[PDB]
Amino acid sequence: AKMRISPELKKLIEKYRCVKDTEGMSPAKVYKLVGENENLYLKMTDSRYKGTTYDVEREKDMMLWLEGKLPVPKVLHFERHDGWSNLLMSEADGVLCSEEYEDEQSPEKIIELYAECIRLFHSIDISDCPYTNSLDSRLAELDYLLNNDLADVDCENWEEDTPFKDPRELYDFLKTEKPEEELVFSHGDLGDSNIFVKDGKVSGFIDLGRSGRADKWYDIAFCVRSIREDIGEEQYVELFFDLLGIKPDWEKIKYYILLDELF
């Protein structure tokens, strides 16, 4: 078994009214620390995932590295207590993108924000980026996640696409169709649930576990995925690409989409 938080962190959480999140489909625990002067956010991952891209210990390193680079939360407190990586952070600036256009019907504005993140990422210098997440490192991690049954291979939200009938089939296809990689700055989980906007621009990025070096089509692929499922009109997928000023590599896009199927 295990535990949770330390005494120190048990003080702050007591001082703020705590509310338990339910927006994190991940193995992490997320709590909002409602406060009088502000709100703080606590996120915790158990040992089983240490060293993995879910380990907040890593999300924290990356969160520290983006200071003065991208709009990310401020690392307040971090600790390893009872085989748990606990991160205390400040409340992202802005509104959740999913809740800024929740009613939606502002397709082009979403497409803009997505395309804005992309251009933005292709600005962060990865000369000193802490982690490299090339397919090699990622297929490595996946394999590992499967061997230790650390991944949900039964009840996930598959894409209606995934041509495969079992986990290893997919793994194999990935480990076998690896596109060439042009390393840029990758978020690792670009989606309206992990992005914050304000007054019309992006004002915050959170959920930075797989943040680091990675092919450029990785994030783009994700935006395509979201765009398609949430708007469902090839029309705005094209527009997205027009705003990016790039031609779609449907092979890479598909590929990278699949790579996320088991995470």
Ligand X SMILES: NC[C@@H]1O[C@H](O[C@H]2[C@@H](O)[C@H](O[C@@H]3[C@@H](O)[C@H](N)C[C@H](N)[C@H]3O[C@H]3O[C@H](CN)[C@@H](O)[C@H](O)[C@H]3N)O[C@@H]2CO)[C@H](N)[C@@H](O)[C@@H]1O
Residue 23 interacts with ligand ADP (CB under 6 A): yes or no: yes
Radius of gyration of the chain (CA): 18
Residue 255 interacts with ligand X (CB under 6 A): yes or no: no
Distance, in Å, from the CA atom of 177 to the CA atom of 32, rounded to the nearest integer, reads 41
Shortest spacing between CB 102 and ligand X, in angstroms = 8
Distance, in Å, from the CA atom of 112 to the CA atom of 169, rounded to the nearest integer, reads 36
Q: Annotate each residue in 217-246 with x if it binds ligand X (CB under 6 A) or - if it does not, as one string.
A: ------------xx----------------
Q: How many CB atoms lie within 10 A of CB 215?
A: 23
| Distance spanning both ends of the chain, measured CA to CA | 24
Distance, in Å, from the CA atom of 178 to the CA atom of 239, rounded to the nearest integer, reads 27
Residue 18 interacts with ligand ADP (CB under 6 A): yes or no: no
Distance, in Å, from the CA atom of 61 to the CA atom of 67, rounded to the nearest integer, reads 11
Which of helix, strand or coil describes residue 120?
helix
Shortest spacing between CB 207 and ligand X, in angstroms = 6
Residue 146 interacts with ligand X (CB under 6 A): yes or no: no
Residue 207 interacts with ligand ADP (CB under 6 A): yes or no: yes
Distance, in Å, from the CA atom of 208 to the CA atom of 66, rounded to the nearest integer, reads 10
Stretch that binds Mg ion, among 67-75, 138-146, 205-213, 226-234 (CB under 5 A): 205-213
Indicate the residue among 26 and 134 with the shorter CB distance to Mg ion. Answer: 26
Interface positions with ligand ADP (CB under 6 A):
21, 23-26, 28, 30, 41, 43, 73, 89, 91-92, 96, 193-194, 206-207
Interface positions with ligand X (CB under 6 A):
25-26, 98, 156-159, 189, 191-193, 229-230, 260-261, 263
